[PDB]
Design a protein around this ligand. Structure first.
Ligand code: KDM
Ligand code: KDM
Ligand code: KDM
Length: 383
């Protein structure tokens, strides 16, 4: 790979700073957040970078009062190089006591689409969970009030502002479903112009002129809840999904007409956690980048890899993120999201956990922003 001849570049710092950290991230209203989880990042067509997360207000749990927050690079050209290149925290949506999350953006010309999941603030995946007012949640169910919803918001001003989210559940989630997820992480725009957003059990397909899309479901058999989508160099679609059981990623391939079976990919260990994938370039040699925790049981084995295959059948060992460790952010590992920057880097958001309460709800979570070039990957000591 000719990119391995370049001097290796990496840089890393916290981008979403939990309440316990110095200079914690707060909205302009003064609302701060115990934890940030569930990253998503995209480069827009101006070069600006948009970074999204769940602002988990009171603890690190997946339910309760959770706002979908974001930052942008201050200019379209700074590429997120330094901490001071980023704007202060902003909010996409935070209405009510509800959960707003699962950011899943896709850039479409001069429009950025952002899909997101939602649940009523009185409900949680399992039910019976304690909330800050001393009540217990109800279990998410198939009722309109109790199910997971799917919302869409857009921006036509390079992420500066967002439309009021529109509930798309009745047309873009199967009837009768209870739990749901979109992404989280990102969707894609195909070479043939359609938009594809990964979701639980299905893809969501956007068709129409750029910025004036209408959406439909592509129902999958055997897909996961938290999926990734890619158009591989052969032009085919690939789903690479978080498994139910701990072990390995679950992968399927196909087209807009349908995907083939999902199968365990024994080349990609995974501890039942979200991952991220990125088509980096289409010119020779075409590359796909994959990031997850490369372990069958822990989230603290973050690894970024390259595939040169036209179907992304095989990835290399790649490079363990711990080789460029970041201090003062807790223990790195968990969900991730990647984009390509204008200056030929990969920009990745990566979860990190202070772990003060171990796996309990009081452990503060933050999100790291990494940038690195292909050379840093290629030249990994074990690659
Ligand atoms: O590190 C990069 O990104 C590089 O500079 C060198 C790579 O070998 C080449 O594949 C790549 C590609 O030409 C552009 O990314 C446009 O897709 O450019
Ligand atoms: O860190 C996790 O594991 C998490 O709990 C965080 C997410 O907020 C949640 O939506 C998702 C979900 O619980 C699983 O995908 C099983 O449905 O996973
Ligand atoms: O590697 C893991 O998975 C770990 O042990 C350490 C991680 O730093 C932490 O974020 C994670 C989390 O508390 C559990 O995965 C919840 O089930 O636990």
């Amino acid at each position: 790979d000719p990119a391995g001849k370049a001097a290796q570049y990496h840089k890393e710092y916290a981008l979403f700073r939990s309440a316990n950290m110095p200079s914690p991230d707060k909205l302009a209203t003064g609302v701060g957040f115990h934890s940030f989880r569930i990253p998503a990042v995209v480069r827009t067509n101006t070069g600006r970078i948009l970074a999204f997360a769940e602002g988990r207000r009171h603890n690190n749990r997946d339910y309760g009062d959770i706002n979908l927050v974001y930052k942008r690079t201050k200019s379209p050209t700074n590429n997120g190089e330094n901490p001071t290149d980023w704007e202060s925290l902003r909010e996409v949506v935070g209405t009510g006591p509800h959960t707003w999350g699962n950011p899943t953006p896709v850039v479409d010309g001069n429009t950025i689409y952002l899909f997101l999941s939602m649940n009523d603030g009185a409900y949680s995946q399992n039910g019976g969970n304690t909330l800050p007012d001393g009540t217990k949640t109800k279990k998410i169910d198939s009722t309109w009030v109790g199910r997971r919803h799917l919302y869409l918001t857009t921006s036509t001003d390079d992420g500066d502002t967002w439309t009021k989210p529109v509930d798309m559940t009745k047309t873009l989630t199967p009837d009768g479903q209870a739990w749901d997820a979109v992404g989280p992480g990102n969707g894609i725009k195909l070479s043939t112009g359609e938009l594809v957003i990964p979701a639980q059990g299905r893809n969501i397909i956007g068709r129409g002129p750029s910025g004036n899309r209408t959406w439909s479901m592509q129902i999958l058999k055997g897909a996961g809840s938290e999926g990734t989508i890619c158009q591989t160099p052969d032009g085919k679609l690939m789903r690479n999904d978080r498994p139910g059981p701990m072990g390995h990623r679950s992968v399927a391939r196909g087209t807009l007409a349908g995907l083939g079976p999902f199968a365990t990919d024994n080349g990609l260990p995974d501890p039942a956690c979200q991952g991220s994938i990125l088509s980096y370039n289409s010119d020779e040699p075409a590359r796909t980048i994959f990031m997850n925790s490369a372990s069958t049981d822990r989230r603290t084995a973050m690894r970024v890899r390259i595939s040169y295959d036209k179907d992304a059948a095989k990835f290399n060992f790649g490079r363990e993120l711990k080789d460029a460790p970041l201090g003062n952010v807790g223990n790195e590992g968990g969900y991730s999201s990647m984009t390509k920057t204008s200056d030929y880097k990969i920009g990745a958001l990566v979860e990190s956990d202070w772990y003060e309460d171990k796996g309990g709800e009081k452990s503060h979570r933050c999100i790291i922003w990494r940038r690195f070039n292909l050379s840093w990957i290629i030249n990994g000591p074990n690659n």
